[PDB]
Design an enzyme around this catalytic site. Structure first.
Site, PDB file in Angstrom:
ATOM      1  N   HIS A 295      -0.741 -12.653  -2.579  1.00  0.00           N
ATOM      2  CA  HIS A 295      -2.007 -13.311  -1.945  1.00  0.00           C
ATOM      3  C   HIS A 295      -1.568 -14.769  -1.802  1.00  0.00           C
ATOM      4  O   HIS A 295      -2.393 -15.651  -1.451  1.00  0.00           O
ATOM      5  CB  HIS A 295      -3.241 -13.183  -2.666  1.00  0.00           C
ATOM      6  CG  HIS A 295      -4.162 -11.858  -2.443  1.00  0.00           C
ATOM      7  ND1 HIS A 295      -4.947 -11.328  -3.045  1.00  0.00           N
ATOM      8  CD2 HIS A 295      -3.471 -10.908  -1.914  1.00  0.00           C
ATOM      9  CE1 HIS A 295      -5.136 -10.098  -2.978  1.00  0.00           C
ATOM     10  NE2 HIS A 295      -4.293  -9.618  -2.035  1.00  0.00           N
TER      11      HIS A 295
ATOM     12  N   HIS B 295       0.744  -1.349  -0.095  1.00  0.00           N
ATOM     13  CA  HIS B 295      -0.014  -0.166  -0.059  1.00  0.00           C
ATOM     14  C   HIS B 295       0.697   1.247   0.018  1.00  0.00           C
ATOM     15  O   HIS B 295       0.535   2.180  -0.546  1.00  0.00           O
ATOM     16  CB  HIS B 295      -1.231   0.167   1.164  1.00  0.00           C
ATOM     17  CG  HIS B 295      -2.230  -0.875   0.926  1.00  0.00           C
ATOM     18  ND1 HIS B 295      -3.376  -0.642   1.707  1.00  0.00           N
ATOM     19  CD2 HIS B 295      -2.291  -2.063   0.291  1.00  0.00           C
ATOM     20  CE1 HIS B 295      -4.231  -1.660   1.225  1.00  0.00           C
ATOM     21  NE2 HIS B 295      -3.668  -2.554   0.368  1.00  0.00           N
TER      22      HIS B 295
HETATM   23  C1  HEM Z   1      -6.189  -6.318  -7.457  1.00  0.00           C
HETATM   24  C2  HEM Z   1      -5.473  -6.107  -6.467  1.00  0.00           C
HETATM   25  C3  HEM Z   1      -5.516  -6.250  -5.124  1.00  0.00           C
HETATM   26  C4  HEM Z   1      -6.895  -6.370  -4.341  1.00  0.00           C
HETATM   27  C5  HEM Z   1      -8.182  -5.923  -4.735  1.00  0.00           C
HETATM   28  C6  HEM Z   1      -6.260  -6.792  -3.067  1.00  0.00           C
HETATM   29  C7  HEM Z   1      -7.206  -6.736  -2.015  1.00  0.00           C
HETATM   30  C8  HEM Z   1      -6.857  -7.088  -0.791  1.00  0.00           C
HETATM   31  C9  HEM Z   1      -7.846  -7.008   0.250  1.00  0.00           C
HETATM   32  C10 HEM Z   1      -9.283  -6.777   0.347  1.00  0.00           C
HETATM   33  C11 HEM Z   1      -7.072  -7.511   1.561  1.00  0.00           C
HETATM   34  C12 HEM Z   1      -7.614  -7.767   2.859  1.00  0.00           C
HETATM   35  C13 HEM Z   1      -7.237  -6.549   3.897  1.00  0.00           C
HETATM   36  C14 HEM Z   1      -7.849  -7.083   5.233  1.00  0.00           C
HETATM   37  O1  HEM Z   1      -8.905  -7.171   5.556  1.00  0.00           O
HETATM   38  O2  HEM Z   1      -6.850  -7.144   6.100  1.00  0.00           O
HETATM   39  C15 HEM Z   1      -5.936  -7.840   0.881  1.00  0.00           C
HETATM   40  C16 HEM Z   1      -4.811  -8.217   1.915  1.00  0.00           C
HETATM   41  C17 HEM Z   1      -3.524  -8.334   1.284  1.00  0.00           C
HETATM   42  N1  HEM Z   1      -2.901  -8.204   0.350  1.00  0.00           N
HETATM   43 FE1  HEM Z   1      -3.933  -7.806  -1.383  1.00  0.00          FE
HETATM   44  N2  HEM Z   1      -4.984  -6.993  -3.149  1.00  0.00           N
HETATM   45  C18 HEM Z   1      -4.503  -6.743  -4.128  1.00  0.00           C
HETATM   46  C19 HEM Z   1      -3.242  -6.880  -4.474  1.00  0.00           C
HETATM   47  C20 HEM Z   1      -2.263  -6.890  -3.790  1.00  0.00           C
HETATM   48  C21 HEM Z   1      -0.712  -7.049  -3.820  1.00  0.00           C
HETATM   49  C22 HEM Z   1      -0.117  -6.463  -5.423  1.00  0.00           C
HETATM   50  C23 HEM Z   1      -0.046  -7.293  -3.059  1.00  0.00           C
HETATM   51  C24 HEM Z   1       1.464  -7.557  -2.664  1.00  0.00           C
HETATM   52  C25 HEM Z   1       2.142  -7.845  -3.664  1.00  0.00           C
HETATM   53  C26 HEM Z   1      -1.138  -7.639  -2.105  1.00  0.00           C
HETATM   54  C27 HEM Z   1      -0.618  -8.368  -0.610  1.00  0.00           C
HETATM   55  C28 HEM Z   1      -1.697  -8.565   0.379  1.00  0.00           C
HETATM   56  C29 HEM Z   1      -1.291  -9.213   1.224  1.00  0.00           C
HETATM   57  C30 HEM Z   1       0.165  -9.890   1.915  1.00  0.00           C
HETATM   58  C31 HEM Z   1      -2.443  -9.236   2.054  1.00  0.00           C
HETATM   59  C32 HEM Z   1      -2.588  -9.871   3.479  1.00  0.00           C
HETATM   60  C33 HEM Z   1      -2.699  -9.107   4.854  1.00  0.00           C
HETATM   61  C34 HEM Z   1      -2.574  -9.746   6.102  1.00  0.00           C
HETATM   62  O3  HEM Z   1      -2.239 -10.964   6.329  1.00  0.00           O
HETATM   63  O4  HEM Z   1      -2.729  -8.993   7.108  1.00  0.00           O
HETATM   64  N3  HEM Z   1      -2.420  -7.860  -2.578  1.00  0.00           N
HETATM   65  N4  HEM Z   1      -5.636  -7.647  -0.398  1.00  0.00           N
END
Ligand code: HEM
Ligand code: HEM
Ligand code: NA
Ligand code: NA
Lengths: 713, 713
Positions: free
Chosen positions: B244, B77
């Site tokens: 993810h 982010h």
């Molecule tokens: C289409 C693009 C993306 C969408 C819509 C998206 C959406 C989200 C959403 C809704 C969450 C949950 C937040 C929460 O409730 O804690 C999240 C978690 C996360 N996203 Fe994404 N994401 C995107 C791309 C990315 C990218 C590019 C990365 C990194 C390279 C990323 C890495 C993560 C990680 C690691 C989590 C887990 C967080 C945790 O364990 O607390 N995401 N994502």
């Protein structure tokens, strides 16, 4: 574009602390306006102004062939925004040329007056500021029309962006009182720090209070608003009758003919506004206020005809051609000249507020004395015009040029001349050691010097430790200054002073003003030593001691700190949250956000709080100069919650055990909440920051000690 | 308090040019972050970060015992606000810690992540910036969980207040499209320069477009927003699938349990927000997005399980416990671990946007190739994570520390190393004289060097004259660059260069990038001579020429100036007024108000306008460096009005005769209308200012020519 102010409209605004950056100033870092002005040929500027007065331009033809009255109004408005409560407004920064003031309704058509001055400004360039030129022009106007001024001082440097001033909360220009954002409450109590009755007015409504044409009720508003601009009854009567000896008002047709103010007008208007569709839009057809009054039989010459008319006729309520309430003389002949048609004359006319000067009983007595003795009126008006135009310039040491009056006036908070050799660096070291050997503590020393110096405000350059007025009424009795503690400290320092001065040769002596500041320097040094750090705090002597007879006690009341978050002090309960008041104090002290941050964190651990309150004292080594306030505040081991007794006091408890570690106010804890202030706190609470913290504290302490030292400029 | 913004919401805001002053910065004026960072023990920082990963705090307990996922999202982010359109956003200034981004809904609970890093920030202090720390933490999280990163560069200096960025015009967080301030129109066309689908999201809505869960339509949004962040299909799939592979989403109960975001929270929250009333409010009960999805069987370890799940099940639409749309694997067993209870397992789940990677046909092909060749996936994700986190850092010369990758990547706009002696002062004087003898005119020299240098933007440090890319596609064909005139100048300069280089010994040569800049300097010198002034313009050699193969033509397109007020150019008709675009350009060039003023007034008289437009050319001595633009603009003898044909073009006529004297655009006349810009114009239009004007112009010209010179610091 949606902004942070949109999303979080109640969050604190730190940008007021970061105006006036070297980024926004077109002049180089080394430009010194005083040096430029002192070489101006002031006589040549005045001879160009004298000529301009009768050189009419066709885009804004001069009434009676003479721009004098227009320019007197211009200067009076430049000065007339001044409030004694905070020292903000006034002529001292030439703010009438920026927003909002350039577009206030009561400044209508002063855009034209300032544009008339461009060729002169252009000719003399950086050697005469717009700020000084506006005032000078009003002086030359008065001179050209036969009035002897009291004098003139140059030295108001220009500014390059709008001042941040609270002018009221109304969302509508000129809104009548009792609206959703009413500046009035109780029995017509105007809210501090405002000094006008409606948003966009200089003092009062010329038709009467909220448009009701009752001269007796209007007098009440005049008296209250003028007192809020530091003018008493005699000065008020002199100023209104003096100004209205000249020129005319403009209301030749309905106001709906007048278009957008300058800030709202099209780009093609090139900074002018109020363009009028009524006939020629100018000159004979001008509309400014909507009133149509010409006060005297010679509007372009000093006379005593204002009071002759005020007292020699009875007055009838009438309406101008724009529909505004104004007054005409019953059974009078047409004796008042017309401004453009030499074959036409008019009956005497008055504003409701002019009649206040005859129908208010206290003003009537002054007005009659001025009518019977017009030499008294002329002298009162000259003195009052000087004060009006100079009230925000600060100490006399900032007065430049060959026309400064020599008479010292009580409203100047004058400081006596120094007539003896000053202490040198070895003397200063000797005095610091004597002060520390007396048994005065760090807390006492720092608290006293803070109290003496932190009365300064950069808005009108009043206050500061020069003068040693902290020993005099009323400062010695103010609650924030802790009157019984203060008296004990001053007794001990006065004994130190007597002993040092008795031992000298050659006339060398130290003032109490200097010794109070020096003693605070010794406290800061000792606190640094207490923390294991050897530092020398800079000190510059040359302050002098004023007498009680040279101190106006009633004028000094506006300098009382009722809220000083640097000492965790609030005299009572306010509408405005204490963190907002801290940023307002920081602005008055000329501090940036990083200087405010360092200073407050140090003052907490030095024992500067009023009453020895433990609020924000986040240290176990009080009287040592450390960054503990920041380390402890930012420690996530501690959880904070408001107390049940008082929502503005917070308990900090160990997050795991619940044990009470600290207490703090909103002023303490804002440094751990506001995202920008917390970033600053993080720099000073880092493990690498002790040396930086000490050095930046010393620097900002010294800055505060020197705020009023215009003798070293 | 009613403000100027309240009264005149359409007036131009110059405070964006004066942010980031030395007033707001707590560091001293000569703090140099690069020097501090180069001395940091980066290895020690990393060991402390590794330790943190599994040191759970009770106020925000770690999912699965490991904070790695949370930190990867945090770094993602931090970087993910980046727009290629203007280069604004990104990780490069640490802005996630300030408003508004610290309180954007999609940044919920990243306040907790940043607070978990405070003890490390504190320990290393000014030697590692927040900006670098947020990225390094993300890297360490990856490494801790078994993923080998491509590298890391330090050097992102911290900033001290919010950046001025247009994020959209909506007045409601998260507002769906088609409202009064819709960022969408036509067939789902997102407005430039925005790169997210709703106000307060990073890229897209995880439930699908406007909340509709159609993975194919979501793919379209993902493709468009990622392209607007400089990422193509392969990079996009690698980044989403890579991220993810880790962690989980949080939606354990209804969102109504979540309280105020950090900028709205009470003072006692001490900078944190989103406090939740649902059960324990944290850990197992956490609510962040409202979704409840855990992607893999090993959320704390790098795996190839994302694509095994994506392709190995069919998916059914369901709802989280908060009500949000998400997907569950049909007939799967409970194989996914719970974050807190070892007795619980869960079925595989996916977001709508994760299924986009399977159901969009072009992503499907990539995803399958990654599934079949996981070494390819790993390498693409490592590269794409590097690019994501470094895309806004600028030239490689700015990259600090011992982990910088040696490989040169196309998106870095690489410039070749200089391998030869540089020209000295005598050579520069010889070249300038050759350029002036060739017959190139002042207008041509000034125009060409301006065109080459003014592509710089401080937002992402892309652009500038280094590289001579003005001679390559696509810059050589841009309409603002006057392609036919440009070609003729470059031919003449390239013949000068060939002759000079062919006569040298000892390997000395001049690059065309240097010569274009030097020739601009000779034009300015000649224009000063034309005005009767002896002026030397500073020049620093050392730029090199990039090749076409080192210049990505599609990435270069975002640098095209569609509005350049400095050349009085506007490519088409825009909804934003041209003077707002000029200030936006000035900001990207890092100019203050007085620099923007002096620059534009000089460029006008030097002949830098596109197409030789006479608009704003207020002089009778074109190609001479004078302050005529100001003197003539401020002349009250001239009256201005918009033309009938075109309201954005103005005619200036003699006020007395009606005769046409000049024409100008809004960009020209704003300097006569805005009260702060006019105050600056007045300084340079005064009779004492010609020498000032020349010397200030030279300085700002030089500044612009060196904006990309990070090889000199
Ligand atoms: C289409 C693009 C993306 C969408 C819509 C998206 C959406 C989200 C959403 C809704 C969450 C949950 C937040 C929460 O409730 O804690 C999240 C978690 C996360 N996203 Fe994404 N994401 C995107 C791309 C990315 C990218 C590019 C990365 C990194 C390279 C990323 C890495 C993560 C990680 C690691 C989590 C887990 C967080 C945790 O364990 O607390 N995401 N994502
Ligand atoms: C109760 C306080 C005051 C009120 C309500 C007031 C009101 C006004 C109004 C309504 C106008 C007409 C503006 C226009 O239509 O052109 C004006 C004009 C003027 N006022 Fe005042 N005034 C006050 C005090 C002052 C003071 C203190 C001075 C200076 C010592 C001043 C000097 C002038 C002059 C010279 C003009 C004439 C302008 C011209 O000839 O264009 N007034 N006044
Ligand atoms: Na003031
Ligand atoms: Na950026």
């Amino acid at each position: 574009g949606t902004s942070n102010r949109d999303w979080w409209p109640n969050q604190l605004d730190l940008s007021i602390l970061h105006r006036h950056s070297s980024l926004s100033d077109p002049m180089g870092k080394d430009f010194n306006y005083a040096q430029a002005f002192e070489k101006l040929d002031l006589a040549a500027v005045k001879r160009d102004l004298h000529a301009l007065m009768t050189t009419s331009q066709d885009w804004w033809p001069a009434d009676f062939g003479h721009y004098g009255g227009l320019f007197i109004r211009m200067a009076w408005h430049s000065a007339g925004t001044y409030r004694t409560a905070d020292g903000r407004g006034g002529a001292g920064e030439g703010q009438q040329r920026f927003a909002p003031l350039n577009s206030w309704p009561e400044n209508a058509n002063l855009d034209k007056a300032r544009r008339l001055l461009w060729p002169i400004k252009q000719k003399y360039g950086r050697a005469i500021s717009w700020a000084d030129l506006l005032i000078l022009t009003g002086n030359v106007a008065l001179e050209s029309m036969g009035f002897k001024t009291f004098g003139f001082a140059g030295g108001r440097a220009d500014t390059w962006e709008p001042e941040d001033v609270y002018w009221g909360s109304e969302k509508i220009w000129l809104e009548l009182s009792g609206g959703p954002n009413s500046r009035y409450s109780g029995d017509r109590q105007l809210e501090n720090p405002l000094a006008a009755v409606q948003m966009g007015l200089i003092y009062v409504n010329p038709e009467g209070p909220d448009g009701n044409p009752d001269p007796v009720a209007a007098a009440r508003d005049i008296r209250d608003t003028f007192a809020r601009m530091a003018m008493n009854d005699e000065e008020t009567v002199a100023l209104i009758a003096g100004g209205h000896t000249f020129g005319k008002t403009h209301g030749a047709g309905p106001a709906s003919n007048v278009g957008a103010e300058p800030e709202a007008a099209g780009i093609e208007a090139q900074g002018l506004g109020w363009k009028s569709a009524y006939r020629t839009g100018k000159g004979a057809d001008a509309i400014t206020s909507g009133l149509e009054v010409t006060w005297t039989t010679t509007p372009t010459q000093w006379s005593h005809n204002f009071f002759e008319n005020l007292f020699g006729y009875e007055w009838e309520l009438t309406k101008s051609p724009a529909g505004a309430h104004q007054w005409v003389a019953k059974g009078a002949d047409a004796v008042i000249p017309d401004a453009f048609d030499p074959s036409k004359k008019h009956r005497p006319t008055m504003l409701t507020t002019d009649l206040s000067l005859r129908f208010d009983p206290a003003y009537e007595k002054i007005s009659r004395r001025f009518h019977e003795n017009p030499e008294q009126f002329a002298d009162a008006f000259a003195r009052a015009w000087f004060k009006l135009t100079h009230r925000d310039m600060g100490p006399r040491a900032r007065y430049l040029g060959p026309e400064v009056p020599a008479e010292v006036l009580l409203w100047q908070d004058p400081i006596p001349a120094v007539d003896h050799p000053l202490i040198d660096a070895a003397d200063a070291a000797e005095l610091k050691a004597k002060v520390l050997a007396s048994g005065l503590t760090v807390s006492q020393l720092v608290s006293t010097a803070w109290a003496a110096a932190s009365t300064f405000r950069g808005s009108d350059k009043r206050g500061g430790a020069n003068g040693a007025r902290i020993r005099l009424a009323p400062q010695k009795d103010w609650e924030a200054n802790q009157p019984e503690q203060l008296a004990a400290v001053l007794e001990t320092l006065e004994a130190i002073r007597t002993a040092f001065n008795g031992a000298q040769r050659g006339g060398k002596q130290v003032s109490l003003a200097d010794l109070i500041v020096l003693a605070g320097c010794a406290g800061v040094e000792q606190a640094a030593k207490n923390a294991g750090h050897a530092v020398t705090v800079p000190f510059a002597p040359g302050r002098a001691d004023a007498s009680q007879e040279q101190t106006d006690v009633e004028s000094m009341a506006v300098l009382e700190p009722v809220a000083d978050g640097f000492r965790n002090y609030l005299k009572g309960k306010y509408r405005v949250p204490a963190e907002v008041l801290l940023v307002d104090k920081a602005q008055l002290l000329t501090l940036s956000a990083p200087e405010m941050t360092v200073l407050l964190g140090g003052l907490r651990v030095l024992g500067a709080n009023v009453g020895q309150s433990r609020h924000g004292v986040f240290t176990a080594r009080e009287q040592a100069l450390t960054n503990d306030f920041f380390v402890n505040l930012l420690d996530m081991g501690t959880e904070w919650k408001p107390t049940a007794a008082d929502a503005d006091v917070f308990e900090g408890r160990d997050r795991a055990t619940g044990e009470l570690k600290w207490t703090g106010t909103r002023v303490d804890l804002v440094f751990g909440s506001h995202s920008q202030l917390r970033a600053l706190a993080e720099v000073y609470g880092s493990a690498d920051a002790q040396e930086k913290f000490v050095r930046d504290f010393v620097a900002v302490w010294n800055k505060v000690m020197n705020l009023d030292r215009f003798d070293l400029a």
